[PDB]
Amino acid sequence: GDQRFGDLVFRQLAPNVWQHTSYLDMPGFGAVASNGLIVRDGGRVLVVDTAWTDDQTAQILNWIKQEINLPVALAVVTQAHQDKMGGMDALHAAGIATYANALSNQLAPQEGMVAAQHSLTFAANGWVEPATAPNFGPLKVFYPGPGHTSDNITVGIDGTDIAFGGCLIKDSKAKSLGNLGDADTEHYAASARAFGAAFPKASMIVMSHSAPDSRAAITHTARMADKLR
């Protein structure tokens, strides 16, 4: 059963992994879910993505103390948008080390976001430069190329069958891709596929704006993006 905490909802996905869900009632469309991850690794917790706001991200941190009771070593934030980086201030106040794509960190100011404290960079093949992600333990970071945004990154969880597509991958039942101005409609499909190819054993795909899916989300996402070529 999903567990409630204030305005947030947590679902356990593995022994060592949870999905956090927070919501924003942006007028025009109603109530809007966003999902990130919490990972326990030995005696520390790692957070992927904040909630919509500082308050809500506070809530997350409180729930972590209450339910897991281990210190939050680092967060990785996956896109320069409110639903992934809206609670950076809360992470910083609590002494959590924050990491994001250098491009994400560059776009943040103009987006009204607070930059992560550290910047990640990527090799030509999409894998994060080891030196920029020290002591990430089970978190495997991959840049698949431009997709929903120029900056979207993805995360796999070694030891588990889970991979995080962030805002790149949409549910396998999506009727539209919901690409906006900042979407790269030329490379989207190949970027979706590259993520699939990077995490080839992952059976459960977690995503920002939908409940976790099978590998069908990847191939449906790719097919929807081909149509925009």
From TrEMBL:
Q: This protein's superkingdom?
A: Bacteria
Q: Which reaction does it catalyse?
A: a beta-lactam + H2O = a substituted beta-amino acid
What Enzyme Commission number(s) appear in the record?
3.5.2.6
Major subcellular site: periplasm
* Chain sites annotated for binding Zn(2+) 1: Q79, H81, D83, H148
Q: Which UniProt keywords apply?
A: Antibiotic resistance, Calcium, Hydrolase, Metal-binding, Periplasm, Plasmid, Signal, Zinc
Q: Which residues bind Ca(2+)?
A: D54, D89
Q: What residues does Zn(2+) 2 bind to?
A: D83, C167, H209
Q: Which residues carry this modification: Cysteine sulfenic acid (-SOH)?
A: C167
Q: Name one GO molecular function term.
A: metal ion binding
Kindly list the places in or outside the cell where this protein is found, as annotated in its UniProt entry: Periplasm
List cofactor names only: Zn(2+)
Query: Is the keyword Signal in the record?
Result: yes
Metallo-beta-lactamase domain boundaries: 33-209
GO biological process terms on file? antibiotic catabolic process
Spell out the subunit comment.
Monomer.
Q: Which protein family is it in?
A: Belongs to the metallo-beta-lactamase superfamily. Class-B beta-lactamase family.
Can you say what this protein is called?
beta-lactamase
Q: Which organism is it from?
A: Klebsiella pneumoniae
Lineage runs: Bacteria, Pseudomonadati, Pseudomonadota, Gammaproteobacteria, Enterobacterales
Q: Gene behind this chain?
A: blaNDM-1
